[PDB]
């Protein structure tokens, strides 16, 4: 029983590392890019304003 | 005599720094030093603290006299050298003389005109380039330079140029780059052929 | 033939495109192809260098006469095109000649004066509209436009207008779809009844 447990564990805790793995560094810097895109663009904006 | 503020006295010779800055503290010195008549950059956050190496400079150092200012801070920094007059002091004689007549003191709140800020920072320049000329070894406190950036800014919106780069205008990197130009070992016209050096410390709140 | 620049050509007629315009690379031919009359658009950024796709365009092509105009590019691109056409050479119908013999070159660097590029432009526009009445296809391409919407920001900006959007003047729209507009296949004014057909590459950066 011990055993059987481990490695469904070992499976569980692989997969949900990967999906964290993946989207702590995919998601995020497209998001904060961006960010620094729509900042930029707004203050060119006002500047011609 | 009268000395206008825009401007630097001329050197005969800058000469590279060859000794290093003593600090108090050992961390700091062994294994990030800083060298006598150099540049260095402090960051400032509430309560992060920034007296235990205003306080450890003052007192522990192999630097002659000390120059503070500032623009938009308290009297609590204020009441508290005076406190460090007789606590602070040095016994270089084995006796108690106040960091008083080894320090001078300058600092603005934020009631004081916008150029008052903008120009005290200046005039600790000119004051450590008034004592260097003696030769003599200086050290700057260019406090919250952060808020000599936001009066420069407040200036230019009066005198109505354009925003360059986040509200702050066009020059402030060259006027930055201009001010911290004035520093290092040096040596000046005069007969006795002294020798001395500038250190800034400039602290800045991201 | 003395010929005002700013004025179209008259023409009898307007007709559509039936005949496909060569394109060396296999892309760009069996994916987004091109008429043999119509207006292609090439913007791309720096790096990519499409001023060499420009160089293929014109090396080899199906057409009978290339005209390639210059708006603020280096005169090492003429080095190129100016070095390299003589060398090449090809037959059609018999005896082989260089290609030299079948392109015109309209060379103007960033070095020159600014308003000249419109005029540039406008020149060359009206000699590919002189060899389409000669009863021809004339595929020409136009490098750097951005460069003529700079200099007539300039000349608009020096001479005190309001800017409408980026800086650039009100009017940036109708001049260059005017520009444009002088393409397409038409059937030309005479008795011989000749066909004529001219198209346009112009090449944009962002």
């Known amino acids: 029983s011990l055993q059987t447990s481990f490695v469904t564990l070992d499976e569980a805790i692989k997969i949900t590392n990967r999906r964290v793995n993946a989207i702590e560094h995919v998601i995020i810097p497209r998001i904060e890019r961006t960010l620094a895109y729509i900042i930029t663009e707004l203050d060119e904006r006002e500047r011609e304003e | 005599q009268v000395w206008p503020v825009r401007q630097v006295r001329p050197v005969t010779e800058k000469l590279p720094a060859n000794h290093p800055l003593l600090t108090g503290?050992?961390?700091?010195?062994?294994?990030?030093?800083?060298?006598?008549?150099?540049?260095?950059?402090?960051?400032?956050?509430?309560?992060?603290?920034?007296?235990?190496?205003?306080?450890?400079?003052?007192?522990?150092?192999?630097?002659?006299?000390?120059?503070?200012?500032?623009?938009?801070?308290?009297?609590?920094?204020?009441?508290?050298?005076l406190r460090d007059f007789p606590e602070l002091t040095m016994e270089v004689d084995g006796k108690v003389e106040s960091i008083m007549k080894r320090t001078a003191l300058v600092a603005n709140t934020s009631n004081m005109p916008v150029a008052a800020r903008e120009a005290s920072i200046y005039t600790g320049i000119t004051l450590s380039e008034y004592f260097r000329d003696m030769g003599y070894h200086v050290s700057m406190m260019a406090d919250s330079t952060s808020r000599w950036a936001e009066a420069l800014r407040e200036i230019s919106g009066r005198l109505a140029e354009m925003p360059a780069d986040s509200g702050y205008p066009a020059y402030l990197g060259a006027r930055l780059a201009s001010f911290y130009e004035r520093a290092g070992r040096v040596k000046c016209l005069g007969n006795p052929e002294r020798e001395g050096s500038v250190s800034i410390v400039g602290a800045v709140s991201p």
């Open chain 2, 25 to 81: 503290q050992r961390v700091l010195d062994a294994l990030f030093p800083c060298v006598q008549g150099g540049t260095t950059a402090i960051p400032g956050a509430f309560g992060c603290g920034k007296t235990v190496i205003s306080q450890s400079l003052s007192k522990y150092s192999n630097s002659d006299v000390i120059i503070y200012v500032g623009c938009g801070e308290r009297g609590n920094e204020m009441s508290e050298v």
